[PDB]
Every structure is written in C-alpha cells, then in structure tokens.
C-alpha cells in the first residue's frame, strides 16, 4: 500500500522470517512461541493497513483497533508463564518480557524509545541463552541475533515513518 | 521433592531456595519487586502492576525498584509475600502445603518479626511444619565450629555477628549498610570513569559478572595502585556475552577496597576490619580471644581472592600483638547458610523439630522463640 | 538446642567410667548414615600422649581428664575437646559435629553429671600442650 506498509511487509518477509527459521531449527517451546509472536506482527501489520487510510480514532474505536494486538501480546505471555518447567525457558522469557514492544502503536509519543526499553528486556535473557549455547550450537547464538533483528530494525522502521507516534491517515 | 522439606534463605539481595538434601540450591533470584515507573500511555498490552525477582530486573528500566528488606532486615511485607509467592509457586513449583519449610533469619531480628514470617507461612501459605535458623549460626555450624565472630557480606547488607555455643550476642551484633550490589555498582562507575558504557539492565548483569570473575582485594591497596600505574602485570582480560574482548586493570582491586574504605562511595562508616574489631570489643573480655582466632566469612561478597589475607593484616593491626588471629573462608560460603539448611532438614532427627501447624493452632506465637536452634 | 544423636550404650558407659575417674580418656564419633554418636576409643591417656589422639583426617569429640596443680590442689577435671582439622571433613561432617555438641554436653552433664571443667574447639592435637590446657581452664 502506503510506503510504511511496504516497508513493515520488509520487515516481515526479512528479520521475522529469520527469526521463524531459527525458532523452527531449535524447535520445541522455542518453535511453538515464535508462532505466536509472527501472529502478533501479523496482526500489527493489520492496523497499519487499516491506519494507513484511515484518521486517528478515538475510544470505542481505537480500542476495537487495538484489542487484537494487546490480546495477542497476552496469549504470547500466557505460554512463557504456562511453561515454566520448560528446556528454553531464558528463550521464553526473552521473548515474553519483550512482545509488549508491538504496543508502540497504541503510544501518544516517543514509540522508538519504547521498543528500544523492550529490546534492553529481552537482551537481559538473550545474554542468557548466549552464556549457555555459544559452545553447544550455534543454532541458539544465530536465534539471539534473530529476535534481536526484529526489535533494531522495528526502532529502524519507527524513526523513518511514525517517528512521533503511529503516522494515521490525514485524509 | 515429592514431600522433600523445603530450604529458603531470604537474603537482604538474593532468594536462595531448594530441597533439603541436595549440595545447592536450586533456585536463586534477586529478593525485588518492580513497578511501573508512569501511570500508563497506553492500556493492558500485558502491562502488570507489579513484577518480581528477573522480570523486575529485566525490565528495570521502565520500573521503580522496591526491595522488601530494609537495613538487613523483612519491612516491606506484602512485597515480601509476592517474593515468597514467587519462590513456591514460580521457581521451585511446588504446592507449599505439601512440604515443610525451613527459613533462615537474620540479625538482629526483632521477635514480632519472626512471628508475622511464620503467620504468613502458615495462615497465608498453609505449611504443614516450620522451622527458623539464624543464617550466621547456620554458617558458623558447617565452618565445623560453634564459638567464633561471623563477617557476613551479602547483596545489601554486611554483618559482624559474634556467637558462643550456637547463641549469637545481640548487644555486640554490628550492621554496615554496604555489600554486593555496591560494589556492582561503584564497579560500574569507576568503569564509566575509565571509559567503558555499561547502563542497561543487560550491562549491569556484565558488570556483575566481572565483578564475581576478575575483581580482588589487595593485600596493600597502594602498592597495588603503583604497580598498575607503571606495569600492565594486573589486567585481565574479559569476554562480552557477543565475543568483544575487553581489558580490565585497577577497577579489580579498586571495587572491593570499597567494604575496607567506605569512603570510596562516599559512605560515612568505618570498614569491615574495623566494624568486626569494634564487635569483638564490645563482648565481654573472656570471649574476645576465642572470637580472634575464629573469624568466619560467609557470604557471596567474601568469595573475593585476597579478602581472607586482607583481614588477617587489618585484624591483626588492631589486636594486641600477641593475640592469635584467625580468618577461616570455607570454599562454600557464597551458600554456607542454605547448605547449613539443608544439611540439617535432610535428618531423620530433624523431623521432630518441625514447628507443626496443630503446634502454631495450640501455643499461639511464641512457640517459634521456644523452639529454637 | 541443636540436633539430638542418640549416645550408643558403650559411648554411655565409657563415659559412666570416666566420670568415676576409672578412664581418663574417652573419644566419641559421629556415625552421619545412622545419625548416632558411637565410642571411638578408650586409651590410655596421660597429658604428655594427649596430642597423639587428635585425628588429623577427621573431627571428634574428645572427654579427657586433665590432671594438674591449680593454686595448691591437684585437679583431676574433665576436659571436653571438639576437634575438626580443616577442610579434609565435608560441609556435613563440620555441619553434624557443630550441630550436635550441645546435647551430647546437655545429657552428659544430667546424666552422668561429668562437670565439664572447659569446652574447647581445636583445629589439630600439637597445639594440645600442658600450658595451652592450663591457660584454657585457668585463663588470667
Ligand atoms: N565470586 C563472587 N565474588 C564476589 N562477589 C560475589 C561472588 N559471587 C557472588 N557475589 C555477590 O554476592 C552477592 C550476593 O550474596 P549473598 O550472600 O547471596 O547475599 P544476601 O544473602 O544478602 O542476599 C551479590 O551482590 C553477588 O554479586
Ligand atoms: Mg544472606
Ligand atoms: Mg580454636
């Protein structure tokens, strides 16, 4: 559509799908969470579309709007505290302590130091991982790069197009 | 751990939990509970209202931070319970009114204090059997000794706790408000000063880490700060969680000079050589020569290389000349409080010494300071 | 206070004879697996030897009469001695000696009133001279 909604379907079919491809390699939780996230983005991608020709709404609206994202953001959480028992739990944990990065849209202002906190959360457990698997497979240090894309080049994506907040439609 | 007693040392810094029976704890996370810092811009988004232990780490710098023990001792009680909740429930995973739990206390401890940890425990948590350990006690017990002066240093808080016969000398018992998470911290900013960027949650973790690997005290702080100004002899070199190398010099011996010279944060209080002189002192004249050849470090902020040497010099400089002077570091002390826990909830013996829940319901409160260790 | 160890029958009576001053010397052991306190030895023991029974692998318990001149009476006082050598004994050898001292003195003393003269913690048996053992029970 719009040149936002070109570059967060980059967004999509470049870091994201590398970060599905290395959560498929270590598969498990790992797998079954990353699924939920690309639902999450997928749904992000959604709003977008629907912002991108369409003025700022208020109340009834704009919570209709962004009901579908904040439930999604839930449901990514939910897994990571229904499966503390798990082998990837420090994966888990790095991803469900940062996926309410996706809630940047909801923000009046500054969405771009928001995702960039939600990074700094992540990089709490990915800092984990990386201690644990930089000498059993590269696989796990490969992922880490790949869930930390998304976030970079989402704070990327932010400060070109929705650098004050999520860019509605004028007319 | 199907029935298997419970261990639970509250640290003023650190929860460490476990099963009785095995050499370490199981669980071991920060004692903290975070809030957002702002109202809220936006609504639900998995927002909480209150996150505990590595998820209020993680996300610290959106939060307020909050620990429940204050000055060394339990003062923010609903915190305290989301903590304990957190332990059974998210870390250990068990149903607490299957397992009894032995808790470990600190100095100083007021008696009121005790008997809400044990209401709580029982009312709130519904224990079958309970039982509280004084931590320094527990340390001086697996030391393999039962009269000597304990230097515990922890996350937040560092004791000297002089005990004869199993019975620490409340009247005696110095508190210095100064341990691990300082030094984390002043490491990070002599780091800062040096050069180096380390600010998010993520940084502070490898700061931690470099701490707890490279840093040392000094058998002679300024012969140490002349060698490192001329030679490169004392740097180290440290791996960053990517692979970057960095290199560090004067901050490992600089760091942990701090518990010798709080004036290094600018603290106003005299070092832990002094603190456990002074404690020593204040017991009766008959004592102090057992107290002087058994000084005990527990503790994960006396895991520190030289620290033992370190108090063996300053001891000995304050003592009378001919007073015998000993430092005893065993190699567990970083967990000699929880070990002690479970060493001892792991007896057949020791079954009979639970604090039973028809035993609370019968005698009221003050069974917890009659039954006693 | 502390752990309770049931006292073997031959620990019992070993230190029933030298509270009637028909032993001297009587060193207890911690069995850890059956979590008792057994009878380790008996011997003979003058002052001179009492360094010989301190064992450097292991802690101990010790009860020893300690024979002596104090201010012109001759004492004959039980001595009790916790040895522990280092780390050569695990984290629950240390915890168990430490642990259960209190009660094995606390039945000792009802049972048998022993009147134990001093309770000393020692790191090794040289250090078990005449003068250290003097200064120990008559300390100033
Ligand atoms: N090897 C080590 N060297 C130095 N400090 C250490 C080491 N291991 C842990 N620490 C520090 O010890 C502190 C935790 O100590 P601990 O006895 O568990 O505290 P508390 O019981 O008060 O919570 C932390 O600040 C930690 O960084
Ligand atoms: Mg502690
Ligand atoms: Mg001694």
Redesign the interface.
């Known amino acids: 559509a719009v040149p936002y909604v070109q570059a967060f379907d980059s967004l999509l079919a470049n870091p994201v799908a590398e970060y599905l491809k290395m959560s498929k390699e270590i598969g498990g939780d790992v797998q079954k969470h990353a699924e939920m996230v690309h639902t999450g983005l997928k749904l992000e991608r959604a709003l977008l579309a629907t912002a991108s020709q369409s003025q700022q709404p208020a109340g009834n609206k704009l919570s209709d709007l962004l009901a579908p994202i904040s439930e999604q953001i839930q449901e990514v959480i939910t897994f990571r505290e229904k499966n503390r028992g798990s082998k990837f739990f420090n994966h888990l944990s790095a991803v469900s302590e940062s996926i309410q990065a996706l809630g940047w849209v909801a923000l009046a202002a500054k969405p771009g130091p928001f995702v960039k906190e939600m990074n700094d959360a992540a990089m709490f457990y990915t800092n984990r991982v990386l201690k644990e698997y930089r000498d059993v497979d590269k696989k796990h240090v490969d992922w880490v790069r790949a869930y930390l894309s998304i976030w970079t080049e989402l704070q990327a994506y932010i400060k070109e197009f929705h650098t004050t907040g999520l860019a509605w439609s004028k007319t | 751990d199907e029935t298997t007693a419970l261990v639970c040392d509250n640290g003023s810094g650190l929860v460490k939990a476990g099963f009785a029976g095995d050499d370490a704890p199981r669980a071991v996370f920060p004692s903290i509970v975070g809030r957002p810092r702002h109202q809220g811009?936006?609504?639900?988004?998995?927002?909480k209202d209150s996150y505990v232990g590595?998820?209020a780490?993680?996300?610290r710098?959106?939060l307020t931070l909050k620990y429940p023990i204050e000055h060394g001792i339990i003062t923010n009680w609903d915190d305290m319970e989301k903590i304990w909740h957190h332990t059974f429930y998210?870390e250990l995973?068990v149903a607490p009114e299957e397992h009894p739990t032995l808790l470990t206390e600190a100095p100083l401890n007021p008696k009121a204090n005790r008997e809400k940890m044990t209401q709580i425990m029982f009312e709130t948590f519904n224990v079958p059997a309970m039982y509280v350990a004084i931590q320094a006690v527990l340390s001086?017990?697996?030391?393999?000794?039962?009269?000597g002066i304990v230097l515990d240093s922890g996350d937040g808080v560092t004791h000297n706790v002089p005990i004869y016969?199993?019975?620490a000398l409340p009247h005696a018992i110095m508190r210095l408000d100064l341990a691990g998470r300082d030094l984390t911290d002043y490491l990070m900013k002599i780091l800062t000063e040096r050069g180096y960027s380390f600010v998010?949650?993520?940084e502070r973790?490898?700061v931690r880490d470099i701490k707890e690997k490279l840093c040392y005290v000094a058998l002679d702080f300024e012969n140490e700060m002349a060698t490192a100004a001329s030679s490169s002899s004392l740097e180290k070199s440290y791996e960053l969680?990517?692979?970057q190398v960095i290199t560090i010099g004067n901050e490992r011996f600089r760091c942990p000079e701090t518990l010798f010279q709080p004036s290094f944060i600018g603290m106003e209080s005299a070092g832990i050589h002094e603190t456990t002189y002074n404690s020593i002192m204040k017991c009766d004249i008959?004592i102090r020569?057992?107290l002087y050849a058994?000084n005990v470090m527990s503790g994960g902020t006396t895991m520190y290389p030289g620290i033992a040497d370190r108090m063996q010099k300053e001891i000995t400089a304050l003592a009378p000349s001919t007073m015998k002077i000993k430092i005893i570091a065993?190699?567990?002390r970083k967990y000699?409080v929880w070990?002690?826990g479970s060493?001892?909830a792991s007896?057949?013996?020791?079954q009979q010494?639970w604090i039973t829940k028809q035993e609370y319901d019968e005698a009221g409160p003050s069974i917890v300071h009659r039954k006693?260790? | 206070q502390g752990v309770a160890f049931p006292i073997s029958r031959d620990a019992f009576q070993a230190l029933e004879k030298l509270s009637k001053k028909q032993l001297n010397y009587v060193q207890l052991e911690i069995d850890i697996k059956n979590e008792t306190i057994i009878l380790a030895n008996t011997e003979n023991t003058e002052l001179r030897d009492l360094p010989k029974r301190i064992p450097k692998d292991s802690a101990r318990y010790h009860f020893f009469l300690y024979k002596h001149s104090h201010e012109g009476d001759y004492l004959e006082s039980v001595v009790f001695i916790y040895s522990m050598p280092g780390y050569t004994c695990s984290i629950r050898e240390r915890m168990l000696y430490s642990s259960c001292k209190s009660p094995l003195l606390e039945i000792v003393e009802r049972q048998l009133q022993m009147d134990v003269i001093r309770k000393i913690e020692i790191d090794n048996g040289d250090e078990l001279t005449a003068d250290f053992l003097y200064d120990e029970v008559h300390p100033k």
């Open positions: 811009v936006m609504v639900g988004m998995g927002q590595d998820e780490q993680s996300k710098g959106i998210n995973r001086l017990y697996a030391s393999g000794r039962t009269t016969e199993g019975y998010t949650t993520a973790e490898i969680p990517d692979g008959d020569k057992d058994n065993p190699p567990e000699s070990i002690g060493i001892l007896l057949s013996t020791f010494m006693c260790f």
